[PDB]
Structure formats: structure tokens, C-alpha cells
């Protein structure tokens, strides 16, 4: 009984983030995927390219040898290009690796240019005040609609500015997706005392009265998880994405057609693991994933900012703190040495940690060159989690709708007694 | 002891020899998609509740903000307050956000594109070669699951192959030429035939849309809805799954093509466009056709929307099944005695269409679907009715009788409370997910 436990484990209100007076908003350019330190990588040639070329060359490198990963043999060709086929697809709807470009392409800050809300401006939601303010009514209504939109937990939080972005990577808003990798601007996000989310030339700018952040929580496949770091641990994690880009539409759309805005972010605009635990969908861990009851950090984030007034959820605490101090399983299975065996800090490791915040701190440069090695996203640390518990029985193996698991399906159940 | 449901015990006690279950004539002809009551000019047009006739979809407008300021979640259903009313009409809308024009039926165009060379997935991808790579697996068997398991990844409820009926495909497809921009769309419709010849790849020309001659194969997904927000059928919260399934059928395509095209096949994305999807889906499999028109499925009734991909990956075809639907519904006609509108018939099966929205030459339940439409302006919605009375939508119907499964004859014989009551993931039901669990014995033979 999932909603037994959550109810059971509630902390009293406040975030439960221990800071110092160093801390400061973080620079999105800082992290290892954009970093100019970081971003790239040699090839198994010798050959230094962007990180992710590198990496191609290494899933073609596999499908003719017949690998589905690093040293792993595939049962044949066939089976190994199967697992990159699956990959590729599950990208369909994110662009460039994680929709991190704010208000471009589906991060869209307003609904007024999409297909979809031309479609239904006759009838007028999105320009009509709302009709509900109770926070009381709004958090249930929106987080049956975040059901409906794909996420297997739901939170809100008060929007703490701290895990914002002080600046954004993004591209200029005329430059087409061809040229858009090689176009990549940094972007500072400020707030201003405006009447609705808005883009100038200089600056992305998010209303004061921006309140809230519902954190959606989007279960990864276990079976294909368990194959980190191979091909199907990829194909979880690119299918999540597209699912995640979905959920941000459905519920912006909603929430703008309840009389509110609604900015939707992916791996943008500001940093999940954060507001997930701020909004009580876990506690953070030694890897530095948020760690949830019911997926363990099995489970990918994305979140959308709203001046939709909202009930805060509580944070919680099921002992996660206490259990990394003394597991270290993830920093010793970490092909890479990425994760402290260390105790917690509040001085960064190097220029990707944001430091003044109480973690656990991770080389996430070490983690990233592991990438192009091994040909794809690794995961190896979620997948030895014990709080998470060969490919061609993946493949032959148990499935069902978007990778969930009928035996566990029923621990994310809601009622109105849950959302409110 | 209560016999633990068995969804694949139950296909497979039903299933059927090879062959397409679909009874034609020498009447038979392709259809022109032009004909469906939502395009064709003799339905196209209703009135509002002032009497002003308007294109369909803007007088159903008309009442859903008739509804709303009156504090209605449907035709004389007062809602709990405005403030319900409007929660119910801001889900529906936004259901639609992955939906071009009610249904993304205009091939190669949006989200349909018939290759995958300009989407912003396949470009990021290009050095992989993936799309360009011969097939690493010709074998039918291997590439029957490997599809199979992406679909359900693609978030298909059920899945099915079979063969390309021609037939179903319909004769002229309704587009728009490809230099018109989104905001024209609707008022710039045209007709362009569907032609088969001996082409390598998928190709529209200025005057057709060319399928290959090699081209197969069609994958039928089942998209679930929710049993809970379809029985409030015809108000907004059955609208609302409506809604927010067709852009999970979008998303279905799109994903299932890509992963078809980076396996070294092409692939046809269709939703409610290219051809007739309840056709497809009985001769794949799903189900059966009913009275009411639409495929009955085991698992969901007619509770279930449809999509499928057209493509030349070798496939192995599943089989058809008869668990009973053709002599429930020949004794049933709940669906015609609810039918606000009187749409569906409470007659015999015939080769004749009842009108000009009915393909003829197939022997099928023949209803007025101009009627069915007419009944959406009235109602503010997409109805559904039908949908949420028939006995099979109901989760109940499978008993076991110690040597096989059978149908209960028993079933034969507010919103609010959706809003504050059961919801998971995607609107699916933890009681009956079990049901569409799959081993590969489940999507290969
Ligand atoms: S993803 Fe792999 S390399 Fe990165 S931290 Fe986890 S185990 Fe280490
Ligand atoms: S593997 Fe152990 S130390 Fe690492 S995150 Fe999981 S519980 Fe914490
Ligand atoms: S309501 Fe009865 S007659 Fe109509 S489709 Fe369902 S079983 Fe058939
Ligand atoms: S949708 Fe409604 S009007 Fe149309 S056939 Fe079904 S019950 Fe009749």
C-alpha cells in the first residue's frame, strides 16, 4: 500500500535541503553535457568529437561486431541492431537530448501558436479568467489531469528559486534545428513583475507570481533497466523522454485552459531532483538521483511551473539518508569511480556540482566519459539500487503498456484522499 | 475456486483459421474518405442551439460554452458548479495537444509523414545510419516480437498484424496541398488519391500518394480508454478520454515508425487517416465487429481506440478471433435502444449502405451516421454512448466454467465522483492491466 507508506512517512512542512549563505543559482552551461571542459570526447579511434558522436561511433562499432554494449555479444546482428532501432525511436519527441532549449520547439512558454490551441479559440479556455481558485479543488483537478498525462506520481511545491537556473542554454528563436547544436546561447532567467511568462531578446523572463512546480515522476522499465549499462537501459530512458515531453504538454495545455499559465520545462529551466524532493516524490541519494518508494531512482523527472494556486505536498523521509550513509553499492558497481564513498558536503566537487547545498558530491565529468566507452547512457548505478528491486530474454520476455508492470501497477492507484 | 482471468487463454480458445472474416461482394469499391459524415458536404453542416448552420465541430463549440456558463457538464446535466463545468471542457481540449483537426487524418502532413528524413529525432540520428542500414533481420518470426514489444512500448494495448486489405484503403484521402500553413488547413481541403505501383519508398507527387507494391503489412494498436470517464458518455469527461487518446494514437505512430524505419523497413503512419481502422483491426485480430460498427475487443469491449502502421517488414499475420460478438449483437441492440440520435440499426446485417457515409459491398450492421453526427452540436461532445452501454465495455464478462471461458449472459439482461475518485498512469485500470501482460509466446507463434 503505496499511499499507507507515503502518509506514514511525511515530514512536517519545509524543505528538507540543508543549505549554507555560499549557495548561489547554478549556470545550465556548468553541467557535463554542455560544459566546453566536458563536451568532448574521444571516439574508440582516438578521434575527439562531441560526446554523442563519439558514442555513435561506438553503437555502430557494436551492431557490426553483434554487441549490444561494451564486451556484452549480442545473440546476433539482428538482435544488436534491434536495441539501438528501440533507442533511436524512443528520442521521437525530444529534441537534442533532454528538451533543455526554454521556449523552443515543445517547450513552448505560451499555448497561443500551437496547432492545437488554434483549433479550440472559439470556445475561449485560455482566454477566460478562471473559474477556480480554491488551491484546495485546483491541486486535485490538476493532478487527476497529470494522471491522465502520464505521470506515475505527482507533487507540488512552493518554487524554490535556488534550484532555478540562473542562466539557461537555449538557441536564438529563428535559428532552425539543423543548425541548432552548433547555435547554442546561454540565457539568463530573471523575475520580473509581469502578467504572464515571456521571452525578450535579452532575457526569459518567469513571472514573481509564479508560485508552484508540479514534479511528475515517469517509471522506467525494470527488466530493461537491469541491462545498464546496454542497449534496453537505453531504450527505457529514451522512451521516458518522449513521455515526459508529452506530459508537459497535456498539462500545460490544461493548466492554460483553467484561466492559468504554465511554463513546462523537460531538463530544462531548473534542476529535478531538487523540486522532486522538495515536492515530496523522494529523498536524494549517494548517487544524487531522487530515490522514490515506489520506483527507487527507477524513475525519470519533469516538471512545469504554474501560477495555478496549489496545496504544497509534504516532503518525506523513509530512511534513504541513513541507508546511503552505510550501502555505497552504486559507487562501487560505477564503471566510472563517479560516485563518493565520502560523506556529504557542501563544497562541490568541480565545476558541474552546485555547491552550498548539503549532498552527496559526485564527479559527473568521470560519469559522462563513460558514455561514449560504453555507447550509451550507462544507468548502472540506478540499476544496482536495492531500493530500484541478458537482453534476449528482455526481448522475449514480460511487457506491457509503456514498459509499467501489472504487479506493481496498483501501488500508484489515486483517490482524491491521495491528490489532496 | 474463481478461476484466475487469463486474457491470452481466452484468444486463444477464440481464435479463428486464416483468413479475412469480412463477407464481401462483386458491389465492392474503395471509399473515398471525402464520404465520412465529418467531411462530406451533406453532413459536414449543423445547426447550433440558435439554429445557425455552422460546420460541425463550431456549433458543438457553441454548446460547450452554452454549457460552461451554465454551469452543465453535458446536454441538461447541471455539474456541481461552473467551476467543474469549465475543469471537465480544459481537460478535453488539452487531451487533443498531440491532434491535428480532430483525428490526424491528412497523410504526410504534421505529424503523418511518410518518411522520417525531416524530423528533428531522425536528423539528430543521421551519423547511426540506422535509417539507411540494410535490414539486419529479415526473418518474419524475430521481427514479429521485436515489433510486437516496441509497440507495446509505444503505448499500444493490444497489437496485431495482418495482411493489406486493399479494400480498406481508402480510394482518395482528404489532405491539404503541401504549401498550406496550419491556420488555412481547414479551409483549404482537397482530395488526392491512394495509388499502389512499383516504387521503392513512400512518395507523395503533386498529383498522388503512392504506396509500394511491396508494402504488406499493417500493425493495428489498441489504445485503451477509461472505462469510469466513458460511462458519464455523453458528457465532458467522456470527451476528455476520447481526447487524450488520439494523442497517444500520435505518439503511437510516430514512435512504432521510427522504429520500423530504423530497422531498415519503411513505414506509413495513418491515425484516423489512409484507411478504414476497424476493418484492419478485425482481420489483425483485435476483435470483432458489432452492431454498433465498431471493433469489440475481449480485454476492453468497444471500449478501445484504434491506429495502425502500414509497412513492408516482414511479418507474421495473427489470426482472426469469433468469441460470439456477431450473435451477442444480433440479440442485443442495447446500443440502438440508448442511441440518442437513432443512428444505429436494429435490423439484420446487409451488402447495402444506408447512405452515402457507408462503404457497400461488405456484409456489415448499416448505420446512419449522419444522425450519429448531428446528435454532437446537440450534446457539445463526441457522444459515446453506445460505447459506454454495450454489455463487453463492462470489466465483468469473463467467467470460466471449469473447462473454458464464456460470456456472462447476465450482462445482457456523476462526475464529481469521477473527478474525486479512481485514476492511474495514462487513465489505465491496475484491476485489469494484468490482462494485457505479453511473452513472446503471446506475439509470436
Ligand atoms: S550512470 Fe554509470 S558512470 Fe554514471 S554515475 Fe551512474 S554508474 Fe557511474
Ligand atoms: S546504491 Fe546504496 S548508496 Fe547508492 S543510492 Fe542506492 S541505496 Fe544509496
Ligand atoms: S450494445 Fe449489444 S448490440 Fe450494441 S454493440 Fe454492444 S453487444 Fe452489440
Ligand atoms: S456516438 Fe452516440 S449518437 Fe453516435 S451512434 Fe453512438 S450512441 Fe448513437
Not at 565529468?365 to 555507447?375: D, F, R
Request: with cysteine.
Amino acid at each position: 500500500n503505496a499511499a499507507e507508506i507515503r502518509q506514514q512517512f511525511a515530514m512536517t512542512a519545509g524543505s528538507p535541503i540543508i543549505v549554507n549563505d555560499k549557495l548561489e543559482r547554478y549556470a545550465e552551461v556548468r553541467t557535463a553535457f554542455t560544459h566546453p571542459t566536458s563536451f568532448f570526447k574521444p571516439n574508440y579511434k582516438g578521434e575527439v568529437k562531441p560526446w554523442f558522436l563519439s558514442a555513435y561511433d561506438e553503437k555502430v562499432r557494436q551492431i557490426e561486431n553483434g554487441e549490444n554494449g561494451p564486451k556484452m555479444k549480442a545473440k546476433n546482428v539482428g538482435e544488436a541492431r534491434a536495441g539501438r532501432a528501440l533507442e533511436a525511436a524512443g528520442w521521437t519527441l525530444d529534441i537534442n537530448y533532454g528538451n533543455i532549449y526554454p521556449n523552443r520547439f515543445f517547450m513552448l512558454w505560451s499555448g497561443e501558436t500551437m496547432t492545437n490551441t488554434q483549433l479550440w479559440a472559439p470556445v475561449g479556455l485560455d482566454r477566460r479568467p478562471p473559474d477556480t481558485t480554491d488551491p484546495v479543488e485546483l491541486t486535485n483537478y490538476v493532478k487527476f489531469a497529470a494522471r491522465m498525462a502520464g505521470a506515475d506520481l505527482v507533487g507540488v511545491a512552493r518554487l524554490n528559486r535556488n534550484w532555478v537556473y540562473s542562466e539557461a542554454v537555449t538557441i536564438p528563436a529563428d535559428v532552425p534545428y539543423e543548425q541548432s547544436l552548433h547555435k547554442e546561447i546561454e540565457k539568463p532567467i530573471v523575475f520580473k513583475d509581469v502578467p504572464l511568462p515571456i521571452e525578450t531578446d535579452d532575457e526569459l523572463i518567469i513571472p514573481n507570481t509564479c508560485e508552484n512546480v508540479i514534479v511528475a515522476g515517469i517509471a522506467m522499465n525494470r527488466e530493461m533497466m537491469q541491462t545498464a549499462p546496454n542497449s534496453m537501459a537505453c531504450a527505457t530512458t529514451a522512451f521516458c523522454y518522449s513521455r515526459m515531453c508529452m506530459f508537459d504538454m497535456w498539462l500545460c495545455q490544461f493548466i492554460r485552459y483553467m484561466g492559468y499559465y504554465a511554463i513546462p520545462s523537460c531538463n530544462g529551466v531548473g534542476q529535478s531532483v531538487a523540486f522532486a524532493v522538495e515536492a515530496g516524490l523522494g529523498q536524494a541519494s549517494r548517487m544524487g538521483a531522487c530515490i522514490t518508494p515506489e520506483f527507487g531512482p527507477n524513475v525519470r523527472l519533469t516538471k512545469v511551473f504554474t501560477n495555478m494556486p496549489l496545496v504544497p505536498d509534504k516532503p518525506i523521509d523513509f530512511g534513504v539518508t541513513e541507508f546511503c550513509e552505510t550501502c555505497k553499492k552504486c559507487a562501487r558497481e560505477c564503471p566510472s569511480k563517479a560516485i563518493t564513498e565520502g560523506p556529504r558536503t557542501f563544497e562541490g566537487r568541480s565545476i558541474h556540482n552546485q555547491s552550498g547545498k548539503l549532498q552527496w558530491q559526485n564527479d559527473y565529468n568521470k560519469c559522462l566519459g563513460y558514455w561514449p566507452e560504453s555507447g550509451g547512457y550507462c544507468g548502472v548505478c540506478v540499476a544496482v539500487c536495492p531500493f530500484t528491486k541478458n537482453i534476449t530474454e528482455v526481448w522475449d520476455g514480460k511487457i506491457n503498456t509503456y514498459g509499467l508492470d501489472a504487479d506493481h501497477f496498483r501501488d500508484t492507484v489515486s483517490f482524491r484522499k491521495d491528490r489532496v
